[PDB]
Amino acid sequence: ASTDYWQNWTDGGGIVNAVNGSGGNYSVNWSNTGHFVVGKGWTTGSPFRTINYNAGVWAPNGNGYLTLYGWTRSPLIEYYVVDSWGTYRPTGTYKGTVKSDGGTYDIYTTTRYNAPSIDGDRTTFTQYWSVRQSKRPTGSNATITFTNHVNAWKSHGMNLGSNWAYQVMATEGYQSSGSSNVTVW
């Protein structure tokens, strides 16, 4: 499917060189950064959506995530489906496990306090995570069956909002350097 949304945010730390490529393709080259998030997807996420991607380059030097990333409003939730990462595996309060698309994921919740929302203003809000148990191999075509993760989250008391905001396959980094090239359809 065609993607329609370009996600490109940086807090202004070091160098984050993001290229909005052809169709669903993007690249990021970063170095000495703060925190940033870059990817391609859809402005309006769906709990039914099935995401295909091929990360031609996954080369973080330090702490970066290769991840489905998105938000709902009413209420405000930030969510992840983490397929690969750098030096650091993200975690939070363990809720259980889900099998999807050839992988086993851990389910976690977090709370963020005094923290920038989708809109940038500081408040308190919950995050939902599925994080793969070991890293997914990269460079061939990969599916994330989001509804598997929506369903398993619901069985663990993790309900998503009613008003969907954007939903992208992203590179997120934390005080690191690296290169990535992801294609999303």
Please name every residue paired with 16 in a beta bridge, in sequence order, or none if there are none.
Answer: 30
Tell me the C-alpha distance between 172 and 10, whole Å. 10
Tell me the C-alpha distance between 27 and 57, whole Å. 8
PDB experimental method: X-ray
Q: How many domains in the chain?
A: 1
Say what the resolution is, in angstroms: 2.0
Among 40, 1, 49, which Cα is nearest to 164's? 49
Q: What is the CATH number of the domain that holds 131?
A: 2.60.120.180
The amino acid occupying position 50 is T
- Positions marked catalytic: 78, 172
Q: Which helix (H) or strand (E) holds 154?
A: helix 146-155
Are 40 and 26 a contacting pair, CB within 8 Å?
A: yes
Domain extent, residue 153, equals: 1-185
Hey, CA dihedral for 14, 6, 111, 106, is it positive or negative? negative
